[PDB]
């Protein structure tokens, strides 16, 4: 009786939200950006190839200096690369080799990683002893760690396969805020440029916008037909793009609270592993299971170019803060640095 | 380069030398993914031979590294394992269909299309006693078991009731029938009849993995 009545009210609220979004869907992003000229053909060459990982690379993250990057592989090795010289700066042996994510702190003093061991390990890069040591192990998730991102030297946000995201205080080792509401495994998260909000994508084909300080879900974005594997904020923080197993990328707007554009092709039938934006946000780079990385025109939904330099799945990619280059990691155990030429 | 850059490159080359030592150990070790249910008794099988529960054992100068897990997202991590050890409990007829449904998911998994399955039909002694008592009938759960006859090519163990042999091969046929449904020979299922107290379980994985490794080569030399 009471349960049946309540679940009927949820359906009414869902229709109310859907009608509200349809009310403000006066135009389409495709119509708005029809007049602007296309970006043309985007040609990028492999400037660097980072060799030394002996297993599938699953994650990479640039440091804020746009020169150092950290990559994680399931050979149990965290490696920090000097991208200009291809020098290996550090090699961090992981206690658990099943790492799925890695993050570089904006200060550059810490890196984080974690996987099927359900632990987020914090590593101190600047010690008087001259070696990288574990500074904190963040326990509390009951599923695998899928993504992690530093807010500062003391705060980090982690998403897990136990359907929850958490905000952690590294100094005390306790999660100050827990973000619940996803009904599937959360596969990725992205921080807003001001680090006041973050979006997370789960396997329930939905993307939720969370307030870091308040600790609740502000908005929920649907439209995908399968698990979301990747998510990335627009450089101004007013939009984000997702990638799912349905071979499509969607551009959601925070303020319009709805999907704006879909990035899919008939030839593309493979899942998407990673997504990122260029510095101006005009380019959307997506990694695919078909061994390729497709560069999309974010405004016009046109495939601007293809990065074909890997012999296995492109598992991750990322663009530097200055926008100079893009790195792609792959299951073939190699990292490549790409940029164009005049 | 400058004076510090040459020292930096020397540090980078000493890291590569340290990675080289780890690569030799990594490639020489075979990694097995152990799957099953709570009642499968997989934890006993690994214990006798000895998040993610990892076990390393060495048989005849060959190092085996077995991962015990207890799922479409984290199963991509085990994409490069040599074999998958799928364990079921044959005695529990009630949940056999769940095992068959679970086995079909793994066999037809997109990320496990080239990974052979060393299927273990655990607790055969319990299955023999359950059939011998006769209280429970497999035909209740599997009606097609009535029209099943033991093939003449069967090789029962000495001193074994023929009724057990008819039932024991029927369960094995159910899993093997799933294996031949699709795949086109890229990977092979390796049915076995083990028990918890069995001491030869390590050898069965050894010989089956040797066949898996050998069949990798014969695909490479025939340009398949």
């Amino acid at each position: 009786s009471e349960l049946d009545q309540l679940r009927q009210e949820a359906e009414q609220l869902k229709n109310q939200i859907r009608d509200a979004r349809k009310a403000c869907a006066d135009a389409t992003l495709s119509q708005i950006t029809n007049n602007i000229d296309p970006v043309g053909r985007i040609q990028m060459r492999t400037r660097r190839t980072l060799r030394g990982h002996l297993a599938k690379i699953y994650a990479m993250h640039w440091g804020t200096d746009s020169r150092l990057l950290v990559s994680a592989s399931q050979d149990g090795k965290l490696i920090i690369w000097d991208s200009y010289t291809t020098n290996k700066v550090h090699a961090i042996p992981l206690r658990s080799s099943w790492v799925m994510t890695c993050a570089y702190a904006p200060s550059g003093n810490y890196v984080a990683c974690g996987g099927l061991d359900n632990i987020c390990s914090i590593y101190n890069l600047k010690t008087r002893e001259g070696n990288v040591r574990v500074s904190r192990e963040l326990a509390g998730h009951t599923g695998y760690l899928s993504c992690c991102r530093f807010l500062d030297d003391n705060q980090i946000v982690t998403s897990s396969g136990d359907t929850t995201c958490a905000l952690w205080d590294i100094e005390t080792g306790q999660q100050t805020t827990t973000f619940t509401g996803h009904t599937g495994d959360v596969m990725s998260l992205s921080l807003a440029p001001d680090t006041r909000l973050f979006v997370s994508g789960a396997c329930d084909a939905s993307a939720k916008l969370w307030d870091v300080r308040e600790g609740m879900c502000r908005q929920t974005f649907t439209g995908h037909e399968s698990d979301i594997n990747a998510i990335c904020f627009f450089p101004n923080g007013n939009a984000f793009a997702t990638g799912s197993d349905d071979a499509t990328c969607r551009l959601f707007d925070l303020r319009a609270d709805q999907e704006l554009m879909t990035y899919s092709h008939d030839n593309i039938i493979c899942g998407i592993t990673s997504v990122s934006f260029s510095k101006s946000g005009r380019l959307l780079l997506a990694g695919y299971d078909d061994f390729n990385c497709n560069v999309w025109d974010a405004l016009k939904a046109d495939r601007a170019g293809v990065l074909a330099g890997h012999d296995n799945r492109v598992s991750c990619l990322g663009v530097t803060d200055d926008g100079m280059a893009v790195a792609t990691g792959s299951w073939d155990s190699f990292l490549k640095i790409w940029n164009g030429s005049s | 380069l400058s004076a510090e850059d040459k020292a930096a490159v020397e540090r980078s080359k000493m890291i590569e030398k340290q990675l080289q030592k780890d690569k030799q150990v990594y490639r020489r070790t075979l990694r097995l993914l152990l799957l099953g249910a709570d009642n499968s008794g997989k934890s006993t099988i690994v214990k006798q031979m000895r998040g993610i529960f990892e076990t390393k054992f060495q048989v005849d100068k060959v190092n085996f590294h077995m991962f015990d897990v207890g799922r479409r997202k984290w199963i991509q991590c085990f994409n490069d394992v040599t074999a998958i050890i799928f364990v079921v409990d044959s005695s529990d007829y009630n949940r056999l269909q769940e095992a068959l449904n679970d086995f079909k998911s793994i066999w037809n998994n997109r990320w496990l299309r080239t990974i052979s399955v060393i299927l273990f039909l655990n607790k055969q002694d319990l299955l023999a006693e359950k059939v011998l008592a006769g209280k429970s009938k497999i035909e209740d759960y599997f009606p097609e078991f009535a029209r099943y006859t033991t093939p003449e090519d069967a090789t029962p163990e000495p001193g074994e009731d023929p009724r057990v042999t008819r039932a024991k091969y029927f369960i094995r046929k159910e899993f093997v029938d799933i294996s031949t449904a699709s795949g086109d020979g890229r990977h092979i299922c390796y049915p076995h009849f083990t028990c918890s107290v069995d001491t030869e379980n390590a050898r069965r994985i050894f010989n089956d993995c040797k066949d898996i490794i050998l069949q990798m080569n014969l695909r490479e030399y025939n340009l398949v």
């Epitope: 150092l68 000097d82 020098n87 001259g130 070696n131 | 400058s2 510090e4 020292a7 930096a8 540090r11």
Partner: single-chain antibody, 231 residues
């Protein structure tokens, strides 16, 4: 804590041989390159030898090349300096210096206490030998080099050291602008090409000492004469 203790020094006859040891504790010794730097009594610092991490690269100063042998024992975390044909010119305090080299590292960050031995090329110029100073007042120290220390990669390989009376030298500024860990923010390093300035705002009693500018553009590493601050 990070420690570097030297031993083996003492009075030796001219033309003799002596073995200096540097025991390291509290840090990963095998990851650090090691230098020997000596300082003659009432004189400036003089670089002696260098052995890299992994013992793959070894450098010597011209005045000691062929007579001194530098070696390390990574399992024991001990640094050695085998000396032969010792002359009266070798009478100095010998310092054990750790230095690790990667992008953004701080070489020459820690110095040992030193051991005293008594026996019976880019030019770095610090013309101002001494500067009378008062607490709370801003002081500038100038350094010059015969060659441009700016490399094509953008780095300017200039280092600043402070040797308080009775104490081992301490790193202040590495690569001409970066501030070493544990150094107050009042120290600031500014330079361009061949001319460099060290500005010390709000001088304090602890800042009193001799300041040396060292170049790390190429070997052999050379020190400036040194500028002394006195009250």
């Amino acid at each position: 804590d990070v420690q570097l203790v030297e031993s083996g020094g003492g009075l030796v006859q001219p033309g003799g041989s002596r073995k200096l040891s540097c025991s390291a504790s509290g840090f990963a010794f095998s990851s650090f390159g090691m230098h020997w730097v000596r300082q003659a009594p009432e004189k400036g610092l003089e670089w002696v030898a260098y052995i890299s991490s992994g013992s793959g690269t070894i450098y010597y100063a011209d005045t000691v090349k062929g007579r001194f042998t530098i070696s390390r024992d990574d399992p024991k975390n001990t640094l050695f300096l085998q000396m032969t044909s010792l002359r009266s010119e070798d009478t100095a305090m010998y310092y054990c210096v750790r230095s690790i080299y990667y992008y953004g590292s701080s070489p020459f960050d820690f110095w040992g206490q030193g051991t005293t031995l008594t026996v019976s090329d880019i030019v770095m110029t610090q013309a101002t030998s001494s500067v009378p100073v008062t607490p709370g007042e801003s002081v500038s120290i100038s350094c010059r080099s015969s060659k441009s220390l700016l490399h094509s990669n953008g780095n300017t390989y200039l280092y600043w050291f402070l040797q308080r009376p009775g104490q081992s030298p301490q790193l202040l500024i590495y690569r001409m602008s970066n501030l070493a860990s544990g150094v107050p923010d009042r120290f600031s390093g500014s330079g361009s090409g061949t001319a460099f300035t060290l500005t010390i705002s709000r001088l304090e009693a602890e800042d009193v000492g001799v300041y040396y500018c060292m170049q790390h553009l190429e070997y052999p590493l050379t020190f400036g004469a040194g500028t002394k601050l006195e009250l």
